[PDB]
């Protein structure tokens, strides 16, 4: 579009700057510049798609708790941050349980390879060992899970997005949520879909024993239950984008807490809902493709304690402090680890 | 890898105009831009990957002329514009071949699905009507074709990379080639893959006869013979690839005519050759986001006659101008549509 236009005027010979001192007043481009270089800078600011600025009346953490207070249809978006006091084992590394998982299943090329459903099919036995090390009521849910239950109790959490699959999220008890990745918390056939509950395969997980499907003959292969983890490939479930339409015209505030938004779906929510809405960050590094109005950067546990202790109340009856102020906005807690 | 670098910063407070001094000296960036939004502009300068930028000394057509005569490993990419007088059925519009085809065959849904190697299995029938009405010795190459051609007789083409399936390459006589989206040169079968020339199926697609595979079994369905014709999904041919590592390192000049590089791989050769190397662009229309030393716009046919005019010698003898100049390097002709 801006592209044509630039291509009409290249037609007539226009002066680019002619165009940049509209563009770009109060701005006066260097004389060394090539004029298709400053054509190329024209379309560019044409095309860039109007990203949310930050709003500059909410800065500071006394102003994140007013907002926490204050607002009640909060959307929380969150990453491996949120669990990694939960003493998870890490699977996505070839050195993790992926390690454990080479030496009895040394079919196994990747630690992707008991993610892909292609593999499955082949082997389902070693994911089944996998989903016993991380099956929910084996792990405590961190203070993080907990902040995020209370609000949902008290009617504020409009939504919980997550990139996890620990289903902490259950286990917390957290009900108005959406894991992005998949979950535990049910489980289908491959073949004839049938769901069951997270209940359903527990037992049969726990004594290593592949769960069948009652529906489908004994005499079937791939009857096999398979919690609803997106595998390789597979789409993102029909839950998430409906939620979306919905959620984008109505939250009056959004949190991210963990993540560091750059693998898809969860990565566009912030760029695409209102700007006016508040945008807070909670991360052990800062997310400088994105316009937050308040960074709490440091460890989520660390910055999620000291947010309870100050908006009090049954907040506060969760807790179990020093910090680096660089304005406008930006506050370095403990775990600021940026790796 | 600069975004970390930003991040960093990010943790001790710098004042990006600090870096920015640096990164843009002889350009200060006015006052009311977001602390971010010049950290973003940071990650931008230090992320922009080396694009060629315009040789100073090569502008004028004179200029283009010398380089013609000079050089000796020339590849010249092509795409609809060299055969726009060529008289050639149009076939992607929907309104085009595809009309004359949706009345014999009612189950076409687009003109893209002829193209569709799916839809083909199930009726090829359409197809292979098309493939009558374009097929090689039908029509008369256009003066480009001829121009490519003669080059190659001189030995002076290196290669010509086209978009383009109208084969008029080969009736136009050039060897040097290499057909991006395929062709009809050959002909494979979908199974058993025996290769045959153009010529062993022309009688066979002149008599409104699916052209079958002399190996496999008359008692096969998809025995059908294929012109190598790139259909959806398919990949590129393996001759592509091999062909640029080597041509890369080894172009003195690349000459663009016809085509609005937007579609690859042909596209991305330009950004990919030796900045060094000179660039001419002959086409309908301006194309911003590339860098070209000499722009001969208008209608191609036009300008090769004008440079066949100028090269004289056997070039001359293929013949059958006005220009406006726009500096330091732009030529507009008669057919210039910038549409
Ligand atoms: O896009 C810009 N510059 C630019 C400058 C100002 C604003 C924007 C912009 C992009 N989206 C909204 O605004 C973009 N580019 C750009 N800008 C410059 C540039 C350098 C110094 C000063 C200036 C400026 F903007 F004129 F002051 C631009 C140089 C080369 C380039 N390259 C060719 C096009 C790209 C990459
Ligand atoms: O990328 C730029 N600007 C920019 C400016 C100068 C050079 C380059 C550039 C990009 N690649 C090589 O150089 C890019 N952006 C940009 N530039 C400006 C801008 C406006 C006026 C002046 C200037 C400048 F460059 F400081 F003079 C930048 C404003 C907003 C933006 N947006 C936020 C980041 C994008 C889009
Ligand atoms: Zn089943
Ligand atoms: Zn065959």
Redesign the interface.
């Given at each position: 579009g801006p592209?044509?236009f630039?291509?009409?005027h290249?037609?007539?010979?226009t002066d680019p700057r002619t165009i940049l001192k509209d563009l770009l007043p109060?701005?006066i481009?260097?004389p060394e510049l090539?004029?298709?270089?400053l054509?190329?800078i024209v379309?560019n600011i044409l095309s860039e798609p109007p990203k949310r600025?930050?709003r500059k009346d909410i800065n500071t953490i006394e102003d994140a708790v007013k907002l926490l207070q204050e607002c009640k249809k909060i959307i929380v978006l969150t990453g491996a941050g949120v669990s990694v006091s939960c003493g998870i084992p890490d699977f996505r590394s070839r050195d993790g349980i992926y390690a454990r998982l080479a030496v009895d299943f040394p079919d196994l090329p990747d630690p992707q390879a008991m993610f892909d459903i292609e593999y499955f099919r082949k082997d389902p036995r070693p994911f089944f060992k996998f989903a016993k090390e991380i099956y929910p009521g084996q792990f405590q849910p961190s203070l993080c899970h907990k902040f995020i239950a209370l609000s949902d109790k008290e009617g504020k959490l409009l939504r919980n997005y997550t990139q996890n699959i620990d289903t902490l999220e259950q286990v917390a008890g957290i009900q108005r949520i959406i894991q992005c990745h998949g979950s535990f918390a049910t489980a289908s056939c491959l073949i004839c879909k049938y769901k069951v509950d997270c209940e359903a395969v527990r037992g049969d997980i726990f004594n290593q024993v592949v769960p069948r499907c009652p529906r489908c003959p004994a005499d079937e292969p791939l009857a096999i239950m398979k919690p609803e983890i997106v595998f390789f490939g597979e789409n993102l479930p029909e839950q998430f984008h409906r939620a979306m339409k919905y959620d984008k015209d109505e939250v009056d505030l959004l949190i991210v807490i963990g993540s560091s938004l750059k693998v898809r779906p969860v990565a566009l929510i912030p760029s695409s809902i209102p700007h006016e809405v508040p945008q807070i960050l909670i991360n052990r590094?800062?997310l400088?493709?994105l316009?937050f109005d308040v960074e709490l950067?440091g460890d989520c546990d660390v910055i999620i304690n000291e947010l309870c202790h100050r908006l009090g109340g049954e907040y506060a009856k969760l807790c179990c402090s020093q910090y680096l102020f660089?304005?406008?906005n930006?506050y370095?807690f403990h775990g600021?680890e940026?790796?």
């Open positions: 592209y044509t630039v291509q009409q290249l037609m007539i010979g109060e701005t481009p260097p090539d004029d298709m270089t054509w190329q379309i600025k930050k590094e800062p400088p493709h316009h950067l660089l304005p406008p930006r370095i600021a940026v790796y």
